[PDB]
Every structure is written in C-alpha cells, then in structure tokens.
Amino acid sequence: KVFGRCELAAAMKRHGLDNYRGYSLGNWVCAAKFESNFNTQATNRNTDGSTDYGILQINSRWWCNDGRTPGSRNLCNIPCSALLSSDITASVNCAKKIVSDGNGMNAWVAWRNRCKGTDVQAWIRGCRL
Numbered sequence: 001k002v003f004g005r006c007e008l009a010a011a012m013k014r015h016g017l018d019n020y021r022g023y024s025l026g027n028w029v030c031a032a033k034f035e036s037n038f039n040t041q042a043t044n045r046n047t048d049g050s051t052d053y054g055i056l057q058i059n060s061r062w063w064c065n066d067g068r069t070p071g072s073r074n075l076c077n078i079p080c081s082a083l084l085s086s087d088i089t090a091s092v093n094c095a096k097k098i099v100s101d102g103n104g105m106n107a108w109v110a111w112r113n114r115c116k117g118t119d120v121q122a123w124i125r126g127c128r129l
C-alpha cells in the first residue's frame with residue numbers, strides 16, 4: 001500500500017506514535033517519506049547483507065527475521081514480511097522498540113540526515129487529525 005501523507009499521519013497517530021519518546025508526528029511522517037515514500041512494500045538491501053523492510057525500513061540485522069541475515073537478531077519477534085503489510089501495526093510496534101533503544105530517531109539515518117532539525121510540522125500541514 002502507498003499511503004497518502006495525511007492518511008499515514010492519521011494511522012501513526014491512532015497507533016500512538018505522535019510524541020512517542022518525545023517525537024512529534026511530523027518527525028515520523030518525514031522519516032517514512034524518505035525511508036519508503038510511504039510504500040508499505042518497500043525493501044532495500046544494506047551493504048552488510050541485512051535488508052530494510054516497510055514504511056520505516058526496519059533492519060533484519062536487529063529487529064525482524066528474514067532467514068537470510070547471518071548473526072542477526074529479531075528483537076521485534078516478527079517475520080520481516082509482517083513489516084510490508086497494508087496494516088502498519090507491526091511496523092509501528094517495532095518502531096516503538098527501536099526509538100526506545102537509546103539513540104532516539106537517529107536509528108533512522110534518513111531521519112538524521114533529512115528530517116532532524118527541519119520544520120517537520122510541514123509534513124502534517126492540512127491534515128485533519
């Protein structure tokens with residue numbers, strides 16, 4: 001599923017991401033735009049051979065199991081395929097564990113490089129939330 005911007009903002013808010021660990025909703029929408037272009041089915045191979053899955057490009061090195069990432073963990077206890085569903089529950093639940101790991105949203109390099117310190121409220125502008 002390719003989410004609309006406000007559609008994804010509504011879904012993230014309903015799932016309790018708005019101001020989760022102090023990160024306003026626009027931070028999460030911005031991260032999703034540059035990780036996935038709001039596409040739940042997005043997959044990208046990392047140089048280390050792990051893969052990033054779904055709207056928030058969650059990494060098989062630590063967070064989900066894809067059966068092909070040697071020496072990796074599955075700290076969200078989910079098959080990586082669950083991160084590609086039209087229903088973002090698994091992605092959101094897993095993102096809550098990631099952002100709680102100590103480095104906040106710096107875990108998402110695209111957030112650090114493209115969203116951090118920017119006018120992230122623009123990402124929820126015009127949305128009925």
Ligand code: NA
Nearest residue numbers: 060064072073
């Ligand atoms: Na894994």
